[PDB]
Write an enzyme that holds these catalytic residues in place. Structure first.
Site, PDB file in Angstrom:
ATOM      1  N   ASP A   1       2.367  45.315  56.750  1.00  0.00           N
ATOM      2  CA  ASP A   1       1.589  45.953  55.687  1.00  0.00           C
ATOM      3  C   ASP A   1       2.383  46.880  54.772  1.00  0.00           C
ATOM      4  O   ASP A   1       1.835  47.817  54.197  1.00  0.00           O
ATOM      5  CB  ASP A   1       0.397  46.713  56.268  1.00  0.00           C
ATOM      6  CG  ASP A   1      -0.802  45.829  56.484  1.00  0.00           C
ATOM      7  OD1 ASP A   1      -0.994  44.883  55.664  1.00  0.00           O
ATOM      8  OD2 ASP A   1      -1.557  46.095  57.466  1.00  0.00           O
TER       9      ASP A   1
HETATM   10 MN   LIG Z   1      -1.837  46.779  61.639  1.00  0.00          MN
END
Ligand SMILES: [Mn+2]
Ligand SMILES: [Mn+2]
Ligand SMILES: [Zn+2]
Ligand SMILES: [Zn+2]
Ligand SMILES: [Zn+2]
Ligand SMILES: [Zn+2]
Lengths: 217, 117, 65, 114, 84, 1419
Positions: B79
């Protein structure tokens, strides 16, 4: 990280992404919309036509695919790309497309708070329980020790009381009540513990600080 | 949203609230504690129909990133994102930020004034 | 606000092509898809520039000071 | 604020050279060179020229971190072949190849109408 | 309460916590310029020197292991097998 | 500290003994007597009066003089005063207790009103919890109001036994702020004894009664003969705290100054004096009483500011107040404010970002954060230049420093300092430099539930903001980079440095105790990439090999000779990865169809650090058990492993960067046809569901026993629709090509499971809320878009579509419904789990493994006699195969039988050098027989333990590996005979076992304990180093063998748990952390259950028995039924169709036809005219295997004769019990009718409501030895009655189990209780596939069980669970906690982390669990 356009992996078209996300973010979110919007968003950009991504329309990955394909791109979004460092093709093809990204607040610079002091962000019970698990007692000491001066008291070896009259120059220690002159110890405790104990004595309560573990047992 | 895992819509519905856009066109004229105005608010290339009544194409909150889903240098794992620095330079995702501060003069103090000087 | 000068992605000078696009639209009654290709914006990276753009300035020049 | 001034990418700040030359220890007739304020632009170039040269046993380069502008270059050349000379040589080899291109281009550019 | 050099039931091996703490304590000395026991064959860094002293069995410390009843075994860092 | 000297030994508080100041001691220790309630101005001559602030107490005026203790305001520890109270006074804190004791003792003789004679009192007395006893005694004694003279003995109630010969009645004592009021009575309402007499029990009365309580009586209360006597709760003599407790702000000179305690004391003294100046002068009674209650008030208010008011008249006419309770409201709450971690110093927090270019144990610190956090480094010839360079660099240039601190402790502030660039650093000064590359810093991510989420890394100062983490250090922290902030904390002292980098250092955390595996793996890109790079089809052109090669810093510069040299010099993907791997590393693993030719490039073989075969993915290179990280860690050291992550990442990442990996919508599309198979698969279930619908609407579905039609119809539908989604989901997973980016992640191990592909590509599947299909929210229909009573999948919430296909609005809304269920109790699981983990810790916080390998709590109680039953540290245990346990007896003999006297079962003279001369050697064959009978006991022993047959058990020392290392370290050829003697092996191993030492005591008990702790490892060992094994398979030479032995011994020792291990915390966070991942057949499982279990909730949600049928009858479906029926509580209610009360007056002829035949039939070989007639239902009547006679003579034996019973017999088409009372009749009957339908037990054990049979596949040894599954019927019950069910004929009463570990305890004892409790806690942790090394749960389950009962974890105490009075000061009233600690003589062990922080000491935990001393020996 931000790469400059040089290093980015580029498409045959000389287009290069503003933004590279990771494919491992995909299967586990089930975030298919992102892909289909991206697919659409591409067609849209290419075609000037605003891309209807409304829910419950009869629009389809398969239809949006067909349109992209007509626009002379591979219809499933992928694009052969060239590693920016080398120019060599990427062995795999890279799902490429516009996608509406939002820039959210709470920006880095607002959360760099680094309150190091010489003269979240805490060390709470849980981080304490962590350092215990670690075995790291002196760290636990250093970190929980208050600025409170390590004040030095004297104690009776019988009643762990702070009732030791210390003539330090004369090397004379007398604990009245116990008749102590030889069996007397000196221990450093935070002055705020000294106080708390005296406050405890003040309230008719004996906090006896001993120096041996096992009792008269 | 019908192609998303149910909870994911919920999450978005929140973050949209922390998107930077153009809350009002009269923003230059309001003194509000925090303000975040996007340099180059673009309409989403993927609009909704409900979007019309929401005035989103009018006061959009975000921009169309040319996005690559790629394992690249290894720097976009778990992410993160590798953003194109050049794009940044040319203005992509720049934002004004108006923090406006407020201060008053004295409450009841018998000639205990506060002086802006 | 106003046209970004350059397409973010690559840096085509795009901000010299906004009025002309608005023309390609209104006075020449063209559609954005055809119009954008005429301004030369051929890669979607530069198209999304103009086509996505919202000209909020023309709403800012409506307030008095 | 933490952001290092962008010039630091192509411009040498103080005390840094262009090249640091280190004598690879692990192997014989090998050298590690650190280019400061260069990147792949040069790295991948010099390496794949260095690699053509036959009396070069080993050529590789790496930029160990995207943050910093610099890269290391390792050349292992045959016994009695100096890597600096292999560099020099692969360097020249480039300058000459670009001269050609510069020419060939300006040439084929003129023949063009527009 | 003390337990004689014979009849030590405790590990002959140094415990990871002991090492952690010798090295600590020893480095805290080395760091305040207290004198070192080994040859500093290059090292400038206290801990690294402390470790070199442990390595060459030259730390001059005794560890006092307390048993839960209160009695204790003394071991000399010298005696203690460092194998972690 | 206080640079003066004191000969007194320098020590650390080891224990704090809490108690009450006897009035005796209060004087004995005191220095003053304190009479005058004022200070200074003795007729104006300033200073002090012998009354306050001086008589001997601490000085002011900068004066050193202080009883000759000298020193002055900073070095003197203020000495204590004294003040006689004219009258006894209740100490505020104990008014509560005082009253309470007064209710337990007689108010005249001081005699406990209830003795060892009364039986409900010996149970009260036997309680060891001084606090819980006192409560149990009190709740027993407050009933008493008569101090009994003669008590019914242990014999005849005819026979009285004497006791305390004082017969007087006790008052019922109520409180009124500070006065206890007593009211008597000569019994409750008896003639000539009415009306209570309210008299105020004065302090003078109580104190004297307290004095009369025996050392025996008050000790059976909380009280301590020595430390806290009841009488002492009553103040006679008041401690006077000196000037450091109560200051005097004398503003230079010539101004008043004395603190708000001084005035508060001054008013006590006033009242005291005016109470004396009323006895000494003589006075009326309600004048001294008034003068007493004024004093008593002022002593009260002095300590506690929460009574009948606030006396705030202390030098101020506006009226504020401060007591010593309200002093601790700024000193129990300023110590607690600093006990909660608020003033966070030398720490820094920022977004984290991943960075594949930091080593595994680095933390990229932004320069700007680096410039902020200091490290005090002592100037030292070794560092004078560097430090000097920094000090010049300054606060703003990076490798700079903020402060140079000179000898005198002065701080040159390099930032604003006229000498910033002009400092000669002298040895012994502190420079407070910036943290620079390689400083150990402790990097932690909250919520930090996990030793592994506070790890220490080497700093690496870097450019932009944000901390930078190596990706593999990611899940230890449960961190991602979507906004997570992390805290970095700079260890400040050198030992504090050492500790970090020596214990918490990230490499030291790879193999974690929590699941005896690595906890950091290769992840995300690096994983995905490594699989790709590893495929056979992956080959590397020289040009790119050289880079990859050069990328691995640990590369030795030898270019590997390519695995293809032919047309093109061409390296394997494996070959170069194999250079990340160091030498000496081997790994064998086999998958489903691996061979030594592993077709599918399956399995894994690495030899001397060249992966010889297998795709490298999660299995190998992830965090998994056997994996290459586990191996490299154990085999080559933590650091060398840590560096491996670096290499592998760097190589693979470099590789991936130029290969590229993506994922598109294309990856989520199914093969045109697969989609038709999928659409078919679904539409094939909607028939199944539809058929069951039609079936059930017809009423042809038979309800499964103890399950409603509607209950069991859904059950079927849900399974159909799941079988569908699932067979649908498989149908797409098989399709997707090995190119498929989605599947490409799935193969490798990085994010992505089946359900994911399944929902994206095939069916999304059935939604569900509260484990049911979507419920009819609107009346009889789920949306206003369906028709009423629509039970189809589409209606009741099956999402038919993939997410790729998009969801219909209904599907969308039903999905939204299921979704909201998810998030709602994802918020519940977060919130409950959050708090369980904080309870679990608090529970086990203090358990530590002491030097004796015992594991004990703060008190010193043995919880485990050896940590986790084997004295091993869980981070040094591997799953290993106990081979003695498995396979046919036949096979056992083949492997392990060496019989020299048998030309057949002898070792062949090829294996062994002296191989031939061994044939027929009696003497030897007596050794080899010893060996084998031993291996046989072993196999037998093991099958007794692992009844299951489970071969594979976490054990220390991987013996397989050591051998595999021998065979490589010695280049043993499996061709020439080994030079071992049988005596070498057989005796060598026998001799080795005597060397594996967890315990060292020379006595028998320990040597016995040691023999046990090592039993299991030894059977592994015996089965591994068996004589044939050693030669047949291993082929060890004497050299390699002798090596294997000394290695096994080496590692075994390395595997032993270190005294110091906060093994409890470890165990709590090993149970907690994974529970902080439980995000989710019908029994409560997961956190509700965990909060159920730890809570020792007697009122469980899903009480079940699980009974197994007696061995001989397991298959008998009919006996399973016959037990089921004879167990399942079967009431008349359940078998009666209807009841009716007729007026049917003639007990011969009858107004009911269908009964004429039945009264006739009850006249062949009083009564009311009102008849209770029950019509029974055959269905459930014969189903529960029941007779009319049985139902009948049950009711007839339930209602004695008080009911005339008669019933139709079992042939008659209608089953009928006719019953009469034997006039207020119609009402006694509707009562009896109910007493029947509800109360009467036809058959079964009460509380057992449903009883389901189930076939359970059971692992059982067949005759030939090997483990065979033997199916068994197993009744599972809604309802627990383990006592009465245990006893039912035909069950295996040996195995009958309940999840109610509470009933198990109560019926089977505590040891079985614990056993069960461990099986429950573990079921919770197993239900989410998760593993937690046994010892952690053991230790939890041991701690819950140590005291004879199931002691709950999720707090039982309002104070403690195992916390010293000093420790984390709980409640806004620590005073209260301390008051009780006084009264009960709380003995603080100071093994706490807080107590010792309070004391300025390190805990005796781990690194502080021993002392260091200076050796006089070292030459
Ligand atoms: Mn995660
Ligand atoms: Mn996160
Ligand atoms: Zn004393
Ligand atoms: Zn562009
Ligand atoms: Zn003094
Ligand atoms: Zn009595």
């Amino acid at each position: 990280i931000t790469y400059r356009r040089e290093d980015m992996p580029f498409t045959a078209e000389g287009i290069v992404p503003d933004l590279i996300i990771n494919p491992h973010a995909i299967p586990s979110r089930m975030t298919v919309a992102h892909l289909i919007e991206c697919l659409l968003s591409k067609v849209a950009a290419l075609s000037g036509n605003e891309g209807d991504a409304s829910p419950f329309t009869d629009i389809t990955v398969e239809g949006i695919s067909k349109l992209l394909r007509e626009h002379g791109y591979q219809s499933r979004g992928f694009e052969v790309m060239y590693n920016g460092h080398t120019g060599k093709k990427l062995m795999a093809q890279i799902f490429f497309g516009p996608t509406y990204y939002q820039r959210l607040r709470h920006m880095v610079d607002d959360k760099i708070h680094a309150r190091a002091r010489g003269p979240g962000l805490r060390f709470g019970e849980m981080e304490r329980d962590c350092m215990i698990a670690h075995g790291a007692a002196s760290f636990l000491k250093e970190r929980l020790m208050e600025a409170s001066d390590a004040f030095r008291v004297h104690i009776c070896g019988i009643c762990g009381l702070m009732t030791v009259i210390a003539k330090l120059n004369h090397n004379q220690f007398e604990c009245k009540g116990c008749d102590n002159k030889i069996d007397i110890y000196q221990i450093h405790i935070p002055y705020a513990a000294k106080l708390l104990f005296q406050e405890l004595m003040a309230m008719n309560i004996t906090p006896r600080l001993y120096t041996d573990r096992s009792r008269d047992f | 949203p019908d192609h998303n895992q149910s909870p994911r819509n919920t999450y978005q519905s929140a973050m949209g609230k922390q998107a930077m856009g153009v809350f009002l066109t009269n923003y230059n004229v309001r003194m509000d504690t925090m303000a975040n105005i996007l340099y180059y608010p673009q309409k989403p290339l993927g609009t909704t129909r409900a979007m019309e009544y929401l005035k989103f194409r009018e006061l959009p909150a975000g921009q169309n990133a040319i996005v690559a889903i790629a394992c690249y240098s290894g720097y976009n794992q778990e992410d993160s994102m590798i953003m194109n620095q050049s794009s940044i330079d040319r203005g992509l995702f720049r934002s004004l930020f108006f923090r406006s501060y407020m201060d008053q003069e004295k409450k009841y103090g018998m000639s205990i004034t506060e002086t802006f000087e | 606000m106003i046209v970004p000068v350059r397409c973010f992605s690559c840096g085509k000078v795009v901000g010299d092509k906004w009025e002309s696009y608005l023309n390609l639209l209104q006075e020449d009654e063209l559609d954005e898809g055809t119009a954008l290709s005429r301004l030369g914006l051929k890669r979607y990276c530069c198209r999304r520039m103009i086509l996505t753009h919202v000209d909020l300035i023309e709403k800012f020049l409506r307030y008095n000071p | 604020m933490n952001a290092p001034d962008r010039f630091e990418l192509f411009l040498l700040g103080e005390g840094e050279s262009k090249l640091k030359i280190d004598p690879d220890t692990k192997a014989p007739n090998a050298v590690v060179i650190t280019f400061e304020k260069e990147d792949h632009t040069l790295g991948n170039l010099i390496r794949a020229e260095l690699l053509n040269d036959r009396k070069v046993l080993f050529a590789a380069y790496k930029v160990e971190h995207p943050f910093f502008a610099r890269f290391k270059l390792r050349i292992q050349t045959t016994e009695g072949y100096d890597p600096k000379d292999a560099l020099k040589n692969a360097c020249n080899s480039i300058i000459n190849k670009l001269g050609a291109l510069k020419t060939n281009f300006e040439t084929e550019w003129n023949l063009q109408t527009l | 309460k003390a337990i004689p050099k014979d009849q030590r039931a405790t590990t002959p091996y140094m415990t990871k916590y002991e090492r952690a703490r010798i090295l600590g304590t020893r480095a805290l000395q080395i760091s305040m310029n207290a004198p070192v026991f080994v040859d500093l064959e290059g090292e400038t860094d206290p801990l690294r020197i402390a470790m070199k002293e442990l390595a060459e069995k030259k730390i001059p410390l005794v560890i006092r292991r307390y048993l839960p009843d209160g009695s204790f075994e003394d071991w000399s860092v010298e005696e203690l097998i460092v194998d972690l | 500290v206080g640079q003066q000297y004191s000969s007194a030994p320098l020590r650390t508080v080891k224990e704090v003994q809490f108690g009450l100041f006897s009035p005796e001691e209060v004087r004995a220790i005191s220095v003053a007597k304190i009479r005058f309630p004022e200070t200074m101005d003795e007729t104006q001559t300033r200073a002090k009066i012998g009354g306050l602030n001086d008589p001997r107490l601490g000085s002011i005026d900068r004066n050193l003089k202080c009883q000759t203790c000298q020193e002055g305001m900073n070095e003197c520890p203020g000495h204590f005063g004294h003040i006689d109270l004219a009258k006894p006074v209740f100490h505020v804190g104990f008014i509560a207790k005082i009253k309470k004791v007064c209710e337990c003792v007689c108010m005249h003789c001081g005699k406990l009103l209830l003795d060892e004679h009364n039986e409900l009192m010996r149970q009260a007395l036997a309680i060891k919890d001084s606090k819980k006893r006192f409560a149990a005694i009190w709740t027993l004694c407050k009933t008493k109001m008569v101090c009994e003279t003669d008590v019914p003995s242990e014999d005849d109630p005819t026979q009285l036994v004497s006791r305390g010969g004082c017969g007087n009645t006790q008052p019922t004592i109520r409180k009124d702020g500070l006065k206890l009021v007593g009211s008597w009575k000569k019994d409750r309402a008896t003639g000539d004894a009415d009306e209570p007499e309210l008299r105020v029990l004065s302090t003078e009365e109580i104190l004297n009664i307290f004095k009369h309580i025996s050392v025996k009586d008050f000790t059976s209360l909380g009280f301590n003969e020595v430390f806290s006597r009841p009488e002492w709760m009553i103040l006679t003599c008041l401690p006077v705290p000196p000037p450091p407790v109560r200051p005097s702000i004398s503003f230079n000179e010539s101004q008043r100054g004395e603190d708000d305690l001084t005035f508060k004391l001054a008013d006590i003294l006033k009242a005291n004096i005016s109470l004396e100046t009323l006895e000494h002068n003589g006075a009326p009674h309600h004048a001294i009483e008034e003068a007493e209650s004024l004093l008593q008030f002022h002593v009260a208010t002095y300590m506690d500011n929460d009574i009948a008011g606030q006396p705030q008249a202390l030098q101020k006419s506006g009226r504020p107040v401060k007591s010593i309770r309200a002093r601790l409201k700024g000193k129990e709450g300023r110590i607690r404010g600093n006990l909660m971690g608020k003033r966070v110093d030398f720490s820094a927090r920022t977004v984290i970002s991943g960075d594949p270019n930091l080593e595994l144990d680095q933390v990229g610190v932004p320069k700007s954060i680096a410039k902020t956090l200091t490290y005090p480094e002592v100037v030292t010839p070794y560092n004078i230049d560097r430090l000097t360079q920094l000090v010049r660099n300054g606060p703003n240039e990076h490798p700079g420093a903020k402060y140079v601190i000179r000898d005198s402790g002065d701080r040159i502030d390099l930032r604003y300092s006229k000498r910033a660039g002009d400092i000669q650093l002298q040895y012994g000064w502190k420079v407070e430099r910036h943290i620079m590359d390689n400083d150990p810093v402790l990097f932690n991510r909250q919520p930090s539930l996990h030793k592994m989420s506070m790890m220490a890394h080497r700093v690496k100062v870097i450019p932009y903001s944000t901390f930078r983490l190596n990706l593999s250090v990611t899940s230890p922290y449960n961190a991602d980079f979507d906004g997570d902030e992390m805290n970095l904390h700079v260890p400040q002292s050198e030992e504090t440095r050492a500790e970090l980098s020596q214990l918490c250092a990230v490499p030291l955390q790879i193999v974690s105790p929590q699941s005896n595996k690595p906890c950091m793996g290769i992840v995300q890109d690096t994983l995905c990439g490594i699989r790709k790079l590893t495929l056979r089809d992956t080959f590397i052109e020289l040009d790119q090999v050289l880079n990859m090669l050069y990328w691995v810093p640990d590369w030795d510069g030898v270019i590997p000779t390519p695995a293809i040299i032919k047309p093109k010099p061409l390296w394997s993907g494996k070959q170069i990865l194999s250079v990340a791997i160091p030498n000496g590393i081997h790994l064998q693993r086999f998958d489903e169809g691996t061979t030594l030719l592993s077709p599918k490039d399956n399995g894994m073989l690495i030899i001397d650090g060249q992966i010889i075969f297998g795709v490298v993915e999660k299995k190998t290179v992830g965090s998994s058990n056997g994996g290459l990280i586990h191996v490299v860690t154990r085999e080559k050291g933590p650091q060398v492993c840590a560096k491996l992550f670096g290499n592998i990442q760097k190589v693979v990442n470099f590789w991936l960067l130029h290969n590229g990996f993506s994922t598109g919508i294309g990856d989520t599309i199914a093969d045109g046809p697969t989609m038709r198979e999928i659409t078919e698969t679904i539409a094939e279930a909607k028939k199944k569901v539809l058929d069951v619908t039609k079936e059930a609407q017809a009423n042809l579905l038979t309800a499964k026993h103890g399950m409603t039609l509607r209950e069991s119809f859904e059950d079927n539908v849900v399974r159909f629709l799941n079988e569908a989604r699932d067979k649908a989901g498989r149908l797409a997973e098989v399709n997707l090509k090995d190119l498929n980016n989605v599947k490409q992640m799935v193969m490798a191990g990085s994010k992505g499971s089946f359900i994911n592909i399944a929902q994206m590509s095939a069916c999304v599947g059935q939604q569900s809320v509260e484990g049911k299909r979507i419920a009819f929210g609107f009346v009889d229909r789920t949306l206003p878009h369906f028709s009423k009573d629509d039970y189809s999948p589409e209606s009741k919430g099956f999402v038919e579509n993939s997410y790729l296909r998009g969801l219909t609005p209904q599907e969308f809304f039903f999905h939204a419904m299921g979704g909201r269920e998810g998030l709602i109790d994802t918020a519940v699981k977060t919130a409950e789990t959050g708090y369980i983990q904080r309870r679990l810790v608090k529970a086990l916080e203090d358990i530590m493994v002491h030097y004796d390998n015992t594991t004990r709590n703060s008190l010193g109680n043995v919880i485990q006699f050896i940590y986790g039953e084997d004295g091993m540290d869980a981070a040094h245990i591997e799953k290993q195969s106990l081979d003695t346990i498995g396979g046919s007896d036949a096979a056992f003999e083949k492997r392990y039988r060496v019989d020299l006297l048998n030309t057949d079962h002898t070792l062949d003279p090829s294996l062994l050098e002296s191989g031939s001369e061994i044939l027929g050697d009696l003497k030897l064959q007596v050794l080899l027989d010893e060996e084998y009978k031993q291996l046989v006991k072993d196999r037998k022993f093991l099958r007794e333990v692992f009844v299951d047959g489970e071969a594979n058990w976490p054990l220390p020392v991987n013996i397989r590996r050591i051998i595999q290392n021998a065979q490589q370290t010695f280049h043993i050829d499996h061709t020439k005979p080994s030079d071992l003697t049988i005596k070498d092996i057989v005796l060598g191993v026998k001799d080795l076992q005597e060397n594996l030492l967890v315990l060292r005591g020379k006595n028998e008990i320990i040597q016995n304990a040691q023999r046990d702790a090592v039993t299991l490892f030894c059977c592994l060992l015996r089965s591994r180093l068996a004589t044939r094994r050693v030669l047949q398979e291993y082929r060890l030479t004497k050299q390699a063998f002798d090596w294997v032995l000394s290695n096994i011994e080496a590692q075994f020792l390395r595997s032993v748990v270190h005294p110091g291990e906060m093994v409890g915390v470890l165990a709590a966070q090993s149970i907690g952390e994974p529970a902080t991942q439980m995000t989710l057949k019908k029994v409560t499982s997961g956190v509700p259950r965990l909060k159920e279990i730890l809570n020792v909730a007697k009122n469980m949600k899903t009480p079940s028995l699980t009974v197994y049928l007696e061995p001989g009858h397991a298959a008998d479906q009919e006996q399973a039924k016959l037990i089921r029926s004879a167990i399942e509580h079967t009431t008349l209610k359940s078998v009666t169709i209807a009841s009716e009360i007729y007026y049917d007056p003639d007990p011969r002829s009858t107004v009911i036809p269908e009964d004429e035949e039945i009264i006739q039939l009850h006249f062949s070989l009083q009564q009311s005219p009102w008849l209770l007639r029950l019509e029974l239902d055959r269905a459930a009547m014969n189903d529960k295997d029941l007779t009319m006679g049985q139902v009948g003579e049950r009711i007839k034996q339930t209602f004695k004769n008080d009911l005339f019973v008669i019933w139709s017999e079992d042939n008659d088409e209608k089953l009928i019990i006719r019953c009469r009372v034997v006039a207020e009749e119609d009402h006694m009957l509707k009562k009896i009718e109910n007493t029947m339908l509800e109360n009467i037990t036809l058959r079964g054990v009460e509380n057992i409501e449903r009883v389901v049979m189930m076939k359970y596949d059971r692992k059982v040894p067949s005759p030939t030895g090997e483990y065979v599954k033997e199916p068994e019927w197993v009744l599972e019950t809604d309802g627990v009655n383990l006592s009465e069910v245990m006893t039912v004929p035909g069950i295996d009463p040996t195995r009958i189990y309940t999840n109610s570990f509470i009933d198990i305890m109560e019926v089977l004892g505590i040891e079985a209780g614990r056993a069960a409790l461990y099986k429950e806690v573990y079921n919770v942790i197993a239900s989410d596939g998760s593993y937690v090394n046994y010892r952690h749960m053991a230790l939890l389950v041991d701690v819950m069980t140590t005291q004879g009962g199931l002691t709950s974890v999720t707090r039982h105490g309002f104070n403690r669970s195992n916390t010293g009075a000093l420790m984390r000061c709980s409640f806004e009233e620590t005073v209260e906690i301390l008051f009780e600690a006084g009264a009960s003589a709380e003995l603080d062990d100071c093994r706490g982390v807080s107590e010792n922080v309070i004391l300025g000491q390190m805990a005796p935990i781990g690194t502080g669990a021993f002392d260091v001393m200076i050796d006089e020996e070292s030459l």
